[model samples]
Target: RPDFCLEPPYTGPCKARIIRYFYNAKAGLCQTFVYGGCRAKRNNFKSAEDCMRTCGGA
Candidate 1:
């Protein structure tokens, strides 16, 4: 898996409520969360399927 799959969720500091997805290595699953729309690094996905494909079973 790529490092981004293990990366933590960066909700960013901006004031926005974007429905984004992030992979949690600990949880071993893709979870839904809110995005601030700015300042986010890697580990961000526009869709849950995107997260799975990027960091799912090999």
Candidate 2:
């Protein structure tokens, strides 16, 4: 299979890949979320685990 491909990207959080349902540790909910493409690479997250720690609650 090809290693790369393009698809319709979701810009909003609602349509996000949802790396984690809860984040920030304080909010106890999906405080940190990322989707679409990276600033350097024009490709979406290869995997959900690729999301870095995000401060969502406080």
Candidate 3:
């Protein structure tokens, strides 16, 4: 799957395949979140690696 930018406010369709990774500033790491497969923000990454690479905090 293509990599997506990690932003926020996921407005995508609720689906199983639409997985997203968000950065947790408090924890200083990336966390996995579900997407709706319709619309989402640039803060959502397609994978953990992508999330950490862009947002930092491995």
Candidate 4:
């Protein structure tokens, strides 16, 4: 499976705060996190379903 889900949620330094989802590989759960509107790579998802689908939900 793709390892992009393994990446930790990164809330960049930008001021635009938006709620997003990311997979916590260790926790095996999709978690809500803040997205700074920039600097996020593959770790960011628009919703929990997207994160779980991409990361192989447990």
Provide the TM-score for each candidate, comma-separated: 0.87, 0.18, 0.63, 0.87
Number of colliding residue pairs in each model: 0, 1, 12, 0
* Residue-level lDDT tens digits of model 1 in 11-51: 88999999888988888888988899898867889898999
Superposed by TM-score, candidate 2 places the C-alpha of residue 16 at a distance from the truth, in angstroms, of 11
lDDT of 2 by residue, 1-58 (tens): 1112222223353443544222223333233335523332222344423322232222
Candidate 1 ranges beyond 4 A from true positions: none
What are the per-residue Cα lDDT tens digits for candidate 4 across 1-58?
4878788889998988899988889889888898888888897889888888888756
| Candidates sorted on lDDT, descending | 1, 4, 3, 2
Worst 10 residues of 1 by lDDT: 3-12
| Model 4 pairs whose backbones collide | none
**Candidate 2 residue pairs that clash:** 22-29
Model 4: lDDT of residue 46: 92
Count steric clashes of candidate 2: 1
What lDDT score is found at residue 3 in candidate 4? Answer: 79
Among all windows of ten consecutive residues in candidate 2, which has the lowest summed lDDT? 1-10
User: In model 1, what are the clashing residue pairs, if there are any?
Assistant: none
